[PDB]
Amino acid sequence: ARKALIEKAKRTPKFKVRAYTRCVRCGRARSVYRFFGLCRICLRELAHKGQLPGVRKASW
């Protein structure tokens, strides 16, 4: 159940305690940052590409 779940994640038919976070890009079930709305994986992928504005390689 991968496809039927990504659709159900956007449904929110019953109570709000089912509208769990869900990555947008690859539709991951966990590790979904709320700010980006993406999973940790696709997040890094884009960041290397430069498609993430203001997101620079951290070094300190």
Binding site: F35, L43, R44, A47, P53, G54, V55, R56, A58
Partner: protein, 98 residues
């Protein structure tokens, strides 16, 4: 009297647009306090590299959100038209209030 906020990401583009306003306001009106850099609010995001299990070698980024402040005193009519027309922003979301 008037106060302008110049939020944005790239400080190179923030410096060009902030310096532009300082020349346009002073060279055509009353006094204007130069660019006042504020504490850059940064979003440091840490995370793991590999897709599966690798609680190490992880990689992390940071969202540089800059801040620059510029105050113009006397409401010059030349400065209002100058900034309304001669402007070249881009990724710099500015917000101005009295």
């Amino acid at each position: 009297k008037i106060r302008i906020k110049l939020r944005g990401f790239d400080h190179k583009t923030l410096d060009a647009s902030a310096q532009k306003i300082v020349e346009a306001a002073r060279r055509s009106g009353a006094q204007v306090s130069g660019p006042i850099p504020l504490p850059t609010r940064v979003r440091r995001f840490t995370v793991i590299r590999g897709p599966f299990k690798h609680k190490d070698s992880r990689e992390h980024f940071e969202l540089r959100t800059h801040n620059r402040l510029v105050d113009i005193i006397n409401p010059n009519r030349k400065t209002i038209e100058q900034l309304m027309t001669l402007d070249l922003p881009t990724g710099v979301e500015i917000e101005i209030k009295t």
